[PDB]
């Protein structure tokens, strides 16, 4: 709670691939949403595709799934892990995602209060 | 024996190169400005991949890639 929601994404997505609970990319995300097995959806607003946001919003509106935004594309690679890390700690080859959907969480406490209570506020 | 090098065949076989289709997710869902969606692809009634896997709209049959089920 001491950190805002912009840092909860760097710990809820960093502790979910360990337990393999994502549908990274658009087609995996669409499969997860149509499978009724989606809990969190993450979008980057930097996608210039017109039909991308429309269908993602429509699927996230027909189903009762929380919608999130990050406003940046490439950096999401570090939130998910599509980067080549160096020995010094330098991620060089970065490929960023546009629609990442969570299906399960891990075992941590720092992110269990920051963004997980940002849902009912919208009700 | 002794090596005789006969490499002659009916030219050379070409390995099937797949076609790079961009954003194939688009054509499965039709989204209007009102929010409601329409499913343009008919779906397979199975258990291994039901609820999310669409079939093939060919000229005479519907076909699921994963199930290999064909409806004529
Ligand atoms: Zn099938």
mmCIF file of C-alpha atoms and ligand atoms in Angstrom:
data_model
loop_
_atom_site.group_PDB
_atom_site.id
_atom_site.type_symbol
_atom_site.label_atom_id
_atom_site.label_comp_id
_atom_site.label_asym_id
_atom_site.label_seq_id
_atom_site.Cartn_x
_atom_site.Cartn_y
_atom_site.Cartn_z
ATOM 1 C CA UNK A 1 0.000 0.000 0.000
ATOM 2 C CA UNK A 2 2.963 2.317 0.502
ATOM 3 C CA UNK A 3 3.628 2.056 -3.247
ATOM 4 C CA UNK A 4 1.006 3.014 -5.811
ATOM 5 C CA UNK A 5 -0.506 0.708 -8.433
ATOM 6 C CA UNK A 6 2.191 1.571 -10.991
ATOM 7 C CA UNK A 7 4.573 -0.595 -8.933
ATOM 8 C CA UNK A 8 2.123 -3.403 -8.120
ATOM 9 C CA UNK A 9 2.321 -4.471 -11.775
ATOM 10 C CA UNK A 10 6.082 -5.016 -11.381
ATOM 11 C CA UNK A 11 5.483 -7.538 -8.583
ATOM 12 C CA UNK A 12 2.212 -9.267 -9.518
ATOM 13 C CA UNK A 13 3.485 -10.097 -13.030
ATOM 14 C CA UNK A 14 6.993 -10.921 -11.764
ATOM 15 C CA UNK A 15 5.542 -13.567 -9.412
ATOM 16 C CA UNK A 16 3.048 -15.219 -11.764
ATOM 17 C CA UNK A 17 5.212 -16.703 -14.525
ATOM 18 C CA UNK A 18 7.002 -18.642 -11.787
ATOM 19 C CA UNK A 19 3.666 -20.423 -11.311
ATOM 20 C CA UNK A 20 2.808 -20.136 -15.041
ATOM 21 C CA UNK A 21 -0.377 -18.106 -14.797
ATOM 22 C CA UNK A 22 -0.357 -15.836 -17.852
ATOM 23 C CA UNK A 23 -1.686 -15.698 -21.416
ATOM 24 C CA UNK A 24 0.920 -13.298 -22.769
ATOM 25 C CA UNK A 25 0.223 -11.887 -26.215
ATOM 26 C CA UNK A 26 -3.115 -11.296 -27.901
ATOM 27 C CA UNK A 27 -4.184 -14.775 -29.051
ATOM 28 C CA UNK A 28 -3.431 -16.442 -25.718
ATOM 29 C CA UNK A 29 -5.303 -13.595 -24.025
ATOM 30 C CA UNK A 30 -8.333 -14.046 -26.283
ATOM 31 C CA UNK A 31 -8.329 -17.785 -25.580
ATOM 32 C CA UNK A 32 -8.163 -17.099 -21.838
ATOM 33 C CA UNK A 33 -11.001 -14.564 -22.031
ATOM 34 C CA UNK A 34 -13.221 -16.889 -24.076
ATOM 35 C CA UNK A 35 -12.332 -19.719 -21.664
ATOM 36 C CA UNK A 36 -13.736 -17.748 -18.687
ATOM 37 C CA UNK A 37 -10.304 -18.120 -17.050
ATOM 38 C CA UNK A 38 -9.199 -14.488 -16.817
ATOM 39 C CA UNK A 39 -8.647 -12.481 -13.631
ATOM 40 C CA UNK A 40 -6.579 -9.461 -14.723
ATOM 41 C CA UNK A 41 -6.091 -7.891 -18.143
ATOM 42 C CA UNK A 42 -3.231 -5.519 -18.990
ATOM 43 C CA UNK A 43 -3.224 -3.169 -21.986
ATOM 44 C CA UNK A 44 -0.649 -0.792 -23.432
ATOM 45 C CA UNK A 45 -2.172 2.388 -24.848
ATOM 46 C CA UNK A 46 0.731 2.797 -27.301
ATOM 47 C CA UNK A 47 -0.814 0.265 -29.722
ATOM 48 C CA UNK A 48 -1.782 2.183 -32.864
ATOM 49 C CA UNK A 49 -3.956 -0.653 -34.202
ATOM 50 C CA UNK A 50 -7.604 0.490 -34.329
ATOM 51 C CA UNK A 51 -9.204 -2.971 -34.198
ATOM 52 C CA UNK A 52 -6.974 -4.150 -31.321
ATOM 53 C CA UNK A 53 -8.363 -1.915 -28.568
ATOM 54 C CA UNK A 54 -11.933 -2.292 -29.839
ATOM 55 C CA UNK A 55 -12.047 -6.087 -29.636
ATOM 56 C CA UNK A 56 -10.055 -6.226 -26.394
ATOM 57 C CA UNK A 57 -12.399 -3.722 -24.736
ATOM 58 C CA UNK A 58 -15.457 -5.534 -26.090
ATOM 59 C CA UNK A 59 -14.268 -8.871 -24.699
ATOM 60 C CA UNK A 60 -13.321 -7.212 -21.392
ATOM 61 C CA UNK A 61 -16.761 -5.545 -21.260
ATOM 62 C CA UNK A 62 -19.011 -8.498 -22.112
ATOM 63 C CA UNK A 63 -17.162 -10.537 -19.491
ATOM 64 C CA UNK A 64 -16.709 -9.165 -15.968
ATOM 65 C CA UNK A 65 -12.922 -8.819 -16.124
ATOM 66 C CA UNK A 66 -10.912 -5.956 -14.643
ATOM 67 C CA UNK A 67 -9.206 -3.792 -17.272
ATOM 68 C CA UNK A 68 -5.803 -2.203 -16.636
ATOM 69 C CA UNK A 69 -3.597 0.170 -18.617
ATOM 70 C CA UNK A 70 0.125 0.911 -18.545
ATOM 71 C CA UNK A 71 0.384 3.586 -21.314
ATOM 72 C CA UNK A 72 3.731 2.138 -22.487
ATOM 73 C CA UNK A 73 4.474 -0.828 -24.757
ATOM 74 C CA UNK A 74 8.151 -1.797 -24.817
ATOM 75 C CA UNK A 75 8.765 -1.594 -21.067
ATOM 76 C CA UNK A 76 6.086 -4.264 -20.571
ATOM 77 C CA UNK A 77 8.729 -6.722 -21.755
ATOM 78 C CA UNK A 78 10.448 -6.327 -18.394
ATOM 79 C CA UNK A 79 7.131 -6.682 -16.555
ATOM 80 C CA UNK A 80 6.607 -10.068 -18.270
ATOM 81 C CA UNK A 81 10.159 -11.132 -19.099
ATOM 82 C CA UNK A 82 10.736 -10.973 -22.875
ATOM 83 C CA UNK A 83 14.185 -9.405 -22.515
ATOM 84 C CA UNK A 84 17.752 -10.683 -22.773
ATOM 85 C CA UNK A 85 19.444 -9.816 -19.486
ATOM 86 C CA UNK A 86 23.185 -9.183 -19.275
ATOM 87 C CA UNK A 87 25.589 -10.115 -16.501
ATOM 88 C CA UNK A 88 25.679 -6.500 -15.300
ATOM 89 C CA UNK A 89 21.871 -6.401 -15.272
ATOM 90 C CA UNK A 90 21.304 -4.729 -18.641
ATOM 91 C CA UNK A 91 18.191 -5.868 -20.577
ATOM 92 C CA UNK A 92 19.171 -5.262 -24.196
ATOM 93 C CA UNK A 93 16.929 -7.273 -26.548
ATOM 94 C CA UNK A 94 13.476 -6.027 -25.525
ATOM 95 C CA UNK A 95 10.186 -7.131 -27.090
ATOM 96 C CA UNK A 96 7.086 -5.562 -25.558
ATOM 97 C CA UNK A 97 3.554 -6.920 -25.316
ATOM 98 C CA UNK A 98 0.221 -5.234 -26.003
ATOM 99 C CA UNK A 99 -2.287 -7.472 -24.165
ATOM 100 C CA UNK A 100 -1.241 -9.601 -21.173
ATOM 101 C CA UNK A 101 -3.883 -11.482 -19.177
ATOM 102 C CA UNK A 102 -3.315 -13.041 -15.757
ATOM 103 C CA UNK A 103 -4.834 -16.411 -14.869
ATOM 104 C CA UNK A 104 -3.192 -17.082 -11.482
ATOM 105 C CA UNK A 105 -1.012 -15.426 -8.845
ATOM 106 C CA UNK A 106 1.924 -16.574 -6.734
ATOM 107 C CA UNK A 107 2.989 -16.270 -3.078
ATOM 108 C CA UNK A 108 3.798 -12.699 -2.038
ATOM 109 C CA UNK A 109 2.394 -9.953 0.177
ATOM 110 C CA UNK A 110 3.663 -6.609 -1.160
ATOM 111 C CA UNK A 111 1.247 -6.633 -4.122
ATOM 112 C CA UNK A 112 -1.734 -8.171 -2.300
ATOM 113 C CA UNK A 113 -2.925 -4.735 -1.127
ATOM 114 C CA UNK A 114 -1.763 -2.181 -3.701
ATOM 115 C CA UNK A 115 -3.716 -2.964 -6.877
ATOM 116 C CA UNK A 116 -5.980 -5.775 -5.648
ATOM 117 C CA UNK A 117 -8.177 -3.214 -3.851
ATOM 118 C CA UNK A 118 -8.337 -0.936 -6.923
ATOM 119 C CA UNK A 119 -11.376 -2.919 -8.153
ATOM 120 C CA UNK A 120 -14.331 -2.098 -5.885
ATOM 121 C CA UNK A 121 -13.401 1.593 -6.098
ATOM 122 C CA UNK A 122 -14.730 1.455 -9.667
ATOM 123 C CA UNK A 123 -18.086 0.055 -8.495
ATOM 124 C CA UNK B 1 33.344 -50.514 -53.969
ATOM 125 C CA UNK B 2 34.039 -47.021 -55.311
ATOM 126 C CA UNK B 3 31.955 -43.875 -54.894
ATOM 127 C CA UNK B 4 29.879 -42.877 -57.921
ATOM 128 C CA UNK B 5 28.243 -39.473 -57.453
ATOM 129 C CA UNK B 6 24.831 -39.431 -59.131
ATOM 130 C CA UNK B 7 22.878 -36.458 -57.773
ATOM 131 C CA UNK B 8 20.366 -36.241 -60.628
ATOM 132 C CA UNK B 9 16.694 -36.154 -59.623
ATOM 133 C CA UNK B 10 13.584 -34.413 -60.867
ATOM 134 C CA UNK B 11 14.889 -30.962 -59.877
ATOM 135 C CA UNK B 12 14.790 -30.401 -56.109
ATOM 136 C CA UNK B 13 11.925 -30.634 -53.642
ATOM 137 C CA UNK B 14 10.898 -27.385 -51.947
ATOM 138 C CA UNK B 15 9.992 -27.421 -48.256
ATOM 139 C CA UNK B 16 6.630 -25.877 -47.400
ATOM 140 C CA UNK B 17 7.125 -22.314 -46.172
ATOM 141 C CA UNK B 18 4.328 -21.150 -43.888
ATOM 142 C CA UNK B 19 2.515 -17.898 -44.652
ATOM 143 C CA UNK B 20 2.889 -15.068 -42.128
ATOM 144 C CA UNK B 21 -0.648 -13.888 -41.387
ATOM 145 C CA UNK B 22 -0.883 -10.692 -39.333
ATOM 146 C CA UNK B 23 -3.417 -10.399 -36.485
ATOM 147 C CA UNK B 24 -5.520 -13.463 -37.240
ATOM 148 C CA UNK B 25 -7.453 -12.786 -34.015
ATOM 149 C CA UNK B 26 -9.259 -9.888 -35.723
ATOM 150 C CA UNK B 27 -11.360 -11.941 -38.147
ATOM 151 C CA UNK B 28 -12.780 -14.230 -35.441
ATOM 152 C CA UNK B 29 -14.647 -11.435 -33.614
ATOM 153 C CA UNK B 30 -16.796 -8.714 -35.191
ATOM 154 C CA UNK B 31 -16.945 -5.731 -32.823
ATOM 155 C CA UNK B 32 -19.312 -2.824 -33.422
ATOM 156 C CA UNK B 33 -19.373 0.565 -31.674
ATOM 157 C CA UNK B 34 -22.064 -0.629 -29.229
ATOM 158 C CA UNK B 35 -19.831 -3.218 -27.533
ATOM 159 C CA UNK B 36 -21.611 -6.414 -28.567
ATOM 160 C CA UNK B 37 -19.532 -8.946 -30.500
ATOM 161 C CA UNK B 38 -20.381 -11.494 -33.183
ATOM 162 C CA UNK B 39 -18.543 -14.790 -33.675
ATOM 163 C CA UNK B 40 -17.780 -15.134 -37.388
ATOM 164 C CA UNK B 41 -16.203 -18.605 -37.060
ATOM 165 C CA UNK B 42 -18.190 -21.720 -36.205
ATOM 166 C CA UNK B 43 -16.893 -23.531 -33.137
ATOM 167 C CA UNK B 44 -16.150 -27.196 -32.463
ATOM 168 C CA UNK B 45 -18.184 -29.063 -29.777
ATOM 169 C CA UNK B 46 -15.391 -31.021 -28.092
ATOM 170 C CA UNK B 47 -13.609 -31.206 -24.728
ATOM 171 C CA UNK B 48 -9.899 -30.874 -25.559
ATOM 172 C CA UNK B 49 -10.261 -27.354 -26.981
ATOM 173 C CA UNK B 50 -13.914 -26.273 -26.724
ATOM 174 C CA UNK B 51 -14.909 -22.747 -25.651
ATOM 175 C CA UNK B 52 -12.351 -20.752 -27.601
ATOM 176 C CA UNK B 53 -11.103 -22.754 -30.607
ATOM 177 C CA UNK B 54 -12.717 -21.974 -33.954
ATOM 178 C CA UNK B 55 -13.111 -24.253 -36.963
ATOM 179 C CA UNK B 56 -12.088 -23.880 -40.611
ATOM 180 C CA UNK B 57 -14.612 -22.240 -42.938
ATOM 181 C CA UNK B 58 -13.753 -24.069 -46.152
ATOM 182 C CA UNK B 59 -15.865 -24.164 -49.308
ATOM 183 C CA UNK B 60 -17.606 -27.444 -48.423
ATOM 184 C CA UNK B 61 -16.743 -28.360 -44.818
ATOM 185 C CA UNK B 62 -16.040 -27.060 -41.332
ATOM 186 C CA UNK B 63 -12.818 -28.334 -39.818
ATOM 187 C CA UNK B 64 -11.105 -27.971 -36.442
ATOM 188 C CA UNK B 65 -7.323 -27.886 -36.651
ATOM 189 C CA UNK B 66 -6.727 -29.398 -33.211
ATOM 190 C CA UNK B 67 -9.592 -31.924 -33.211
ATOM 191 C CA UNK B 68 -9.242 -32.968 -36.878
ATOM 192 C CA UNK B 69 -13.054 -33.137 -36.893
ATOM 193 C CA UNK B 70 -14.715 -32.366 -40.228
ATOM 194 C CA UNK B 71 -18.403 -31.578 -40.766
ATOM 195 C CA UNK B 72 -19.602 -31.796 -44.365
HETATM 196 ZN ZN1 LIG C 1 -11.465 -28.578 -31.550
#
